[PDB]
Enzyme design. Structure first.
Site, short mmCIF file in Angstrom:
data_model
loop_
_atom_site.label_atom_id
_atom_site.label_comp_id
_atom_site.label_asym_id
_atom_site.label_seq_id
_atom_site.Cartn_x
_atom_site.Cartn_y
_atom_site.Cartn_z
N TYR A 111 0.84 -1.37 -0.06
CA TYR A 111 -0.12 0.03 -0.06
C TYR A 111 0.72 1.34 -0.16
O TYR A 111 0.32 2.48 0.16
CB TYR A 111 -0.96 -0.07 1.15
CG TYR A 111 -2.53 0.27 0.77
CD1 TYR A 111 -3.02 1.47 1.38
CD2 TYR A 111 -3.09 -0.31 -0.10
CE1 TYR A 111 -4.28 1.95 1.05
CE2 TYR A 111 -4.49 0.21 -0.35
CZ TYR A 111 -4.94 1.23 0.29
OH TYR A 111 -6.18 1.43 -0.13
N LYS A 127 -5.37 -3.95 -3.53
CA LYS A 127 -6.55 -4.03 -2.95
C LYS A 127 -7.14 -5.56 -2.65
O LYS A 127 -7.65 -6.01 -1.56
CB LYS A 127 -7.41 -3.10 -3.23
CG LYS A 127 -8.23 -2.18 -2.16
CD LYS A 127 -8.67 -0.98 -2.82
CE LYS A 127 -9.68 -0.50 -2.04
NZ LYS A 127 -9.37 -0.27 -0.48
#
Lengths: 496, 520
Positions: free
Chosen positions: B87, B160
């Site tokens: 991320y 994700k």
């Protein structure tokens, strides 16, 4: 109870790009993708092949070390094969040797936990007595060369075992880039026979033969079972593998060198490049091997084995078997002679790590100057680097990868120049199985041009594969001139 | 000719001696059998001997499509990955360093220049109109806090994806990603001849509107109930989507709603100690931008739940800016009307719990906190600024400035305060606390709409999972348990105003909380 099947499990299928062959990345145009049903799965760009490889190259320089790059090319061997291979045109000398010897030792020891030697048959010898059933997953046509290392003595470090595929693949990967042999026509394999350093065995995540560094009389026939089940399939394929040079190499070569087309580069290909360096020196010196006597410091297996190489090479222009012992001088194996008062026209170097405080004796005496150390591990031998070795300040090149002196520029000698052209002519002629056979290293002189007195004295520049093609022109003559083969082609043979 | 190469149906060595022979491999794999935990321990031990600043991500992306089930096994055993490995560094490395590289076996890219082939493109993979869930598409605009990355946007969505199924038990078999290549504006990418994407510029017109409008409607047409959400995507586009298409389609926004959820969760976490009803919670917003108002809209959307009108709640909110608090008759009100110096604002507003998603490095001054500290006994600081060293204040000093009588929450991960009287807690407030469970619960309900109430019960289910160290929000280590605790509240809220395909007694969250990373 037995059968469990469902009406609901779906992989969200990938189509016609999982196979590496002809994946070609974004090289697919709109017509190709919409033909193969890739509409919207590739990034909607279009890149020519050479621009695509450069995109990987500029990517590749962004890494600092030489090991993370091997992990990246490992990612591109399974997907878009041609890139990984046609990248080497953009820079072959640096990358491809770096793929082979410096990086694998760090890749095999630290990272060879990959279970993806896809073309590899990581066959065990404990449970598997039936081994040919593995090839059922993989015909006799369109198969040229095959590598089957027992993984016993890698250059940096011997005897890691299950990680020997990356080596066997490395030879194959360097084979094609040097010799043009289609990757589809080669298979990699490495037998986890054991040959395990206790460090490798002690590792819990070894993924190989468990505690089976096993030898004895059982060894050879286990390998012989595999070597005869390969020629049962095809004697039209070169089983070019790499093992320790100590015992198996000659024993296997003596067992199968006459009836089959098998060889090892370390014991056979290396001495060829040495013979190419001798002829490259005799061209400027003008002293033939008849009046040129040699020394073989160390008397190693490859060193003293080169005595048969230099002798049978002198058979063309020289006397009988007894003459070689008078023209060759072995030393330094038991500390011979507690060293050369005569006959110094061509000097070899240390088959041993011992680096020799210079001896300007060869510098002073009347001779044709030609001495080379020929050992990588210590980066030194009986002679120091060429700069210090140039105590007389004439030329000499090193088997150790070395820098130019400075004018006074030589190139490194490596056996990488030999086995591509050796196996390429066998892939061309289709040979079923001598020194006159192996005498292709003279073609290196055909492409050497050491005619310039000072600049070029090395075998050949590394950035050219056309020297391997020139070796093919010298190798294809083994059919008519040297013995058995299956060659019927014209002299050109431009796309073999 | 290597058979059985599909990632999902491959377990590497994990296949037992019989399966290796029965499935026609016959020794291509080494003579070892490794329990999947042993393979994870091997990969974990392997991963660490590297640069580990973006070196790992190179190894994981090859491991992603070489072996799908293991990746979540090793990724299950993590506190580092949930943000650092997938991320931040993809943006730091994969998005730019490996932009001339492709990973698109699953998921697809399309272009604003070709609206025609989508419905022919989508059925490339064998997709049953029934079996799908949580398809994600992003245009790579404003990814994190850097900017347009063009067609690199997949690495975000695919990342994700790794957080969805490892966090919310979604089946990646039933999960897809997409990238809306509409043309980037970053000058580097266009100058770079090796950028594998559209060389065109940004397009903001009816071509764009008809594009997305002709993409969302076929996303539900080809398969309904697919949880469509767009990650790190243009807000002016993002909010526009939900107001326009969110009435008859299941859509949510991680940038705008999941963030607004976890922020809500931390507000009640303090309310458990504050002992105050949320209706009379007067707060001050710092952003007044496109995103800071979205979390303010979600907070206001939950402010009515405890009995606040529209006019009183916006009166209970003051937005602030460095020119000043947003005011009436200010010519440039920037198309927001909940408004009507900062240190003067806190003085008379007396806000008990104030947050700022405005990115202004270190504008929290000891004199500012003290005004709130003296006015309200237990105020709640919320430097939601995601950048690690660009937040509004350091926690250790803020607790010391208020004598620990204040509450904090950080967008970026932080260490405990350790104010030498007593040691406090982190207050990690990422999006990972919300969207996996909101994905699992909505997969169970099969909701045609993801309503406000449905979102609110998620955040206030988070509050019970971590409540009175003094942590307002939980630890990311225990994620697979809280995802169940939030799905129970999602199902509980799905049945309000009758929105669920399914119905059940709720002993079967675990059966639809599937892809437990082991095999068999």
């Amino acid at each position: 109870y037995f059968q469990s099947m469902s009406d609901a499990r779906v992989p969200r299928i990938p189509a016609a790009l999982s196979a590496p062959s002809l994946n070609r990345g974004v090289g697919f145009t709109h017509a190709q993708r919409r033909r193969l049903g890739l509409t919207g799965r590739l990034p909607s760009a279009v890149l020519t092949l050479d621009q695509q490889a450069e995109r990987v190259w500029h990517q590749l320089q962004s890494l600092a070390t030489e090991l993370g790059r091997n992990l990246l090319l490992e990612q591109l061997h399974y997907r878009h094969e041609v890139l990984y291979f046609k990248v080497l045109a953009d820079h072959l000398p640096e990358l491809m040797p770096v793929v082979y010897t410096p990086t694998v030792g760090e890749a095999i020891q630290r990272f060879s936990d990959e279970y993806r030697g896809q073309r590899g048959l990581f066959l065990s010898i404990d449970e598997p007595d039936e081994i040919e059933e593995a090839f059922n997953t993989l015909g006799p046509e369109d198969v040229d060369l095959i590598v089957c290392t027992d993984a016993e003595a890698i250059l940096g470090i011997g005897d890691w075992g299950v990680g020997g595929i990356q080596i066997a693949v490395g030879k194959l990967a360097l084979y094609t880039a040097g010799g043009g042999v289609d990757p589809r026509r080669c298979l990699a394999v490495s037998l986890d026979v054991g040959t395990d350093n206790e460090q490798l065995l002690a590792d819990p995540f070894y993924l190989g033969n468990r505690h089976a560094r096993r030898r004895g009389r059982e060894y050879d026939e286990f390998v012989s079972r595999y070597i005869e089940t390969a020629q049962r399939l095809f004697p039209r394929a070169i089983l070019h593998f790499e093992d320790f040079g100590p015992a198996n190499a000659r024993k296997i070569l003596d067992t199968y060198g006459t009836d089959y087309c098998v060889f090892n580069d370390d014991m056979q290909g290396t001495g060829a490049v040495v013979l190419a360096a001798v002829y490259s020196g005799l061209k400027v010196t003008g002293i033939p091997l008849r009046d040129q006597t040699i020394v073989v410091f160390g008397a190693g297996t490859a060193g003293m084995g080169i005595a048969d190489q230099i002798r049978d090479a002198m058979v063309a222009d020289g006397a009988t078997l007894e003459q070689a012992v008078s023209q060759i001088w072995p030393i330094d194996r038991p500390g011979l002679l507690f060293i050369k008062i005569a006959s110094p026209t061509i000097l070899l170097g240390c088959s041993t790590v011992y680096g020799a405080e210079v001896v300007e004796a060869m510098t002073a005496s009347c001779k044709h100057p030609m001495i080379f150390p020929l050992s990588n591990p210590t980066s030194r031998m009986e002679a120091i680097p060429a700069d210090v070795l140039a105590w007389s300040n004439a030329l000499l090149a090193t088997g150790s990868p070395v820098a130019p002196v400075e004018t006074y520029v030589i190139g490194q000698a490596n056996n990488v120049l030999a086995f591509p052209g050796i196996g390429l002519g066998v892939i061309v002629a289709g040979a079923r199985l001598r020194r006159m056979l192996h005498a292709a290293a003279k073609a290196i002189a055909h492409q050497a041009n050491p005619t310039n007195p000072g600049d070029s004295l090395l075998p050949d520049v590394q950035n050219l594969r056309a020297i391997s093609t020139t070796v093919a022109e010298a190798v294809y003559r083994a059919a008519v001139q040297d013995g058995v083969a299956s060659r019927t082609h014209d002299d050109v043979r431009q796309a073999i």
